[PDB]
Amino acid sequence: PEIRLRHVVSCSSQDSTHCAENLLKADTYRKWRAAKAGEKTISVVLQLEKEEQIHSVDIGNDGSAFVEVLVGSSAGGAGEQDYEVLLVTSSFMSPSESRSGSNPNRVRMFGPDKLVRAAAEKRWDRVKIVCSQPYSKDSPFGLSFVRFHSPP
C-alpha cells in the first residue's frame, strides 16, 4: 500500500514553483527543485502520517546524478546522526548526461532487496531524501516524485 505523507519537515533548498510540498503526493505531476543552479546537494525531510515499515521506494528523477534515502523518527527529535540509511546512494545520471542534461527524468524502483535491510526491518515516520549533482552546476535539479509503499 502507498504510504501517505503528512508534511515537509525541512528542506535545504527549494523553488517557488517546484517546492518540496510537491513531493507529498506523486499524483500531482509536480516537481521539487533547488532554489538555485549550482548547489552540489539538496535535501528534504518528509513526515509520514503514521509510523510505518517501508517495503519499496520509487524515485522519479529530475536532474540529479545521485539520490539517497534515509529514514528517521520524529520521536526524541531527529539529529544528523539520527537518520538511518534506507536506500544507499543510487545513480540516476552519468557525468556525461549530467553535463549535457540527457536523461534527467529517469524513474527507478527499489524493492525490499535493494534497500538496506537493517533499516528496512524497522518502522519510521520521517523520511530524508538527499539529491546530488556534482557533474553540472548549469541548472537547478531535484526530483519529479517519490513513492513509498508499506509491506503488502
Which residue shows C-alpha cell 510540498?
A: 21
Cβ atoms of residues 115 and 87 within 8 Å:
yes
Q: Which of 10, 22, 15 is nearest to 139 (CA)?
A: 15
Q: Which residues contact 110 (CB under 8 A, 6 or more apart)?
A: 56, 57, 58, 59, 87, 90
Q: What is the resolution of this structure in A?
A: 2.6
* SS3 assignment for 136-152: CCCCCCEEEEEEEECCC
Type of residue found at 54: I
Technique used: X-ray
Give the β-pairing of 41-53 and 56-62. unpaired
Q: Residue-wise over 23-58: b if at least 16 C-beta within 10 A, else e?
A: bbebeeebbbbbeeeebebbbbbbbbeeebebbbbb
Q: What's the domain range around 126?
A: 1-152
Tally of domains in the chain = 1
| Rounded Cα gap, residues 1 and 20, in angstroms | 22
What end-to-end distance do the CA atoms of the chain give, in Å? 6
Cβ atoms of residues 97 and 103 within 8 Å:
yes
Collapsing DSSP to helix, strand or coil, 82 comes out as helix
Looking up residue 13, the CATH number of its domain turns out to be 2.60.120.260
| Rounded Cα gap, residues 21 and 31, in angstroms | 9
Sheet-wide strand order for 107-110:
32-33, 142-149, 56-62, 107-110
